[PDB]
Design an enzyme around this catalytic site. Structure first.
Site, PDB file in Angstrom:
ATOM      1  CG  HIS A  33      -8.866   3.985   5.627  1.00 35.72           C
ATOM      2  ND1 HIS A  33      -7.490   4.066   5.674  1.00 35.72           N
ATOM      3  CD2 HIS A  33      -9.253   3.423   6.795  1.00 35.72           C
ATOM      4  CE1 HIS A  33      -7.063   3.558   6.818  1.00 35.72           C
ATOM      5  NE2 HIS A  33      -8.113   3.166   7.517  1.00 35.72           N
TER       6      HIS A  33
ATOM      7  CD  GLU B 179      -0.355   1.177   3.262  1.00 37.87           C
ATOM      8  OE1 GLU B 179       0.744   1.756   3.395  1.00 37.87           O
ATOM      9  OE2 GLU B 179      -1.410   1.644   3.720  1.00 37.87           O
TER      10      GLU B 179
ATOM     11  NE  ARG C  75      -3.608   4.780   3.232  1.00 31.66           N
ATOM     12  CZ  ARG C  75      -3.868   5.981   3.736  1.00 31.66           C
ATOM     13  NH1 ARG C  75      -4.120   7.005   2.945  1.00 31.66           N
ATOM     14  NH2 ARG C  75      -3.879   6.160   5.052  1.00 31.66           N
TER      15      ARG C  75
HETATM   16  N1  LIG Z   1      -8.815  -2.779   5.886  1.00 31.34           N
HETATM   17  C1  LIG Z   1      -7.590  -3.300   5.877  1.00 31.34           C
HETATM   18  N2  LIG Z   1      -6.505  -2.525   6.158  1.00 31.34           N
HETATM   19  C2  LIG Z   1      -5.261  -3.072   6.140  1.00 31.34           C
HETATM   20  C3  LIG Z   1      -5.063  -4.414   5.856  1.00 31.34           C
HETATM   21  N3  LIG Z   1      -3.733  -4.692   5.907  1.00 31.34           N
HETATM   22  C4  LIG Z   1      -3.093  -3.539   6.231  1.00 31.34           C
HETATM   23  N4  LIG Z   1      -4.031  -2.537   6.381  1.00 31.34           N
HETATM   24  C5  LIG Z   1      -3.799  -1.127   6.679  1.00 31.34           C
HETATM   25  O1  LIG Z   1      -2.674  -0.682   5.921  1.00 31.34           O
HETATM   26  C6  LIG Z   1      -1.959   0.291   6.666  1.00 31.34           C
HETATM   27  C7  LIG Z   1      -0.521  -0.165   6.985  1.00 31.34           C
HETATM   28  O2  LIG Z   1      -0.439  -1.330   7.805  1.00 31.34           O
HETATM   29  C8  LIG Z   1      -2.784   0.535   7.925  1.00 31.34           C
HETATM   30  O3  LIG Z   1      -3.788   1.516   7.718  1.00 31.34           O
HETATM   31  P1  LIG Z   1      -3.436   3.061   7.424  1.00 31.34           P
HETATM   32  O4  LIG Z   1      -3.602   3.396   5.955  1.00 31.34           O
HETATM   33  O5  LIG Z   1      -4.319   3.923   8.291  1.00 31.34           O
HETATM   34  O6  LIG Z   1      -1.978   3.272   7.772  1.00 31.34           O
HETATM   35  C9  LIG Z   1      -3.482  -0.787   8.119  1.00 31.34           C
HETATM   36  O7  LIG Z   1      -4.620  -0.569   8.879  1.00 31.34           O
HETATM   37  C10 LIG Z   1      -6.168  -5.190   5.584  1.00 31.34           C
HETATM   38  O8  LIG Z   1      -6.041  -6.376   5.309  1.00 31.34           O
HETATM   39  N5  LIG Z   1      -7.411  -4.631   5.602  1.00 31.34           N
END
Ligand SMILES: Nc1nc2c(ncn2[C@@H]2O[C@H](CO)[C@@H](OP(=O)(O)O)[C@H]2O)c(=O)[nH]1
Ligand SMILES: OC[C@H]1O[C@@H](O)[C@H](O)[C@@H](O)[C@@H]1O
EC number: 3.1.4.8
Length: 94
Positions: free
Chosen positions: A83, A53, A68
């Site tokens: 998100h 990401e 993102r």
């Molecule tokens: N919804 C969701 N978010 C994820 C997943 N794996 C990682 N993330 C998100 O990606 C980012 C990095 O770990 C974090 O959010 P963020 O964009 O607020 O930083 C984390 O919550 C997932 O499998 N599902």
């Protein structure tokens, strides 16, 4: 079952992010490039560490916000304005 979007229709911040992806940065956040786990399987179910990401800047602000791009292991690119709530496959051909 995946929505699709042309790269040219992406907000210019999203396109900036894909440009940074294509030259491997530098990225504006240490969190850029972390594993996206795809816990909800809104994206093809793939092995560990397939997906990564990257922040898309909100226009105006310089916080991360909710926008993102997730990339796949063969360079597939996915857009999420909300998100990780939804994804659109980016078509770099249009
Ligand atoms: N919804 C969701 N978010 C994820 C997943 N794996 C990682 N993330 C998100 O990606 C980012 C990095 O770990 C974090 O959010 P963020 O964009 O607020 O930083 C984390 O919550 C997932 O499998 N599902
Ligand atoms: O602690 C490290 C973190 O610092 C934050 O201010 C930035 O968003 C990232 O560079 C990183 O994820």
């Amino acid at each position: 079952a995946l929505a699709d979007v042309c790269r040219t229709k992406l907000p210019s911040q999203a396109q900036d992010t894909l440009a940074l992806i294509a030259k491997n940065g530098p990225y504006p956040y240490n969190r850029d490039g972390v594993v996206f786990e795809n816990r909800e399987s809104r994206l093809p179910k793939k092995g560990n560490g397939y997906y990564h990401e990257f922040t898309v800047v909100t226009p105006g602000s310089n916080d991360r916000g909710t926008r993102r791009v997730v990339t796949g292991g063969y360079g597939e690119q996915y857009w999420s304005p909300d998100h990780y709530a939804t994804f659109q496959e980016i078509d770099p051909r249009c």
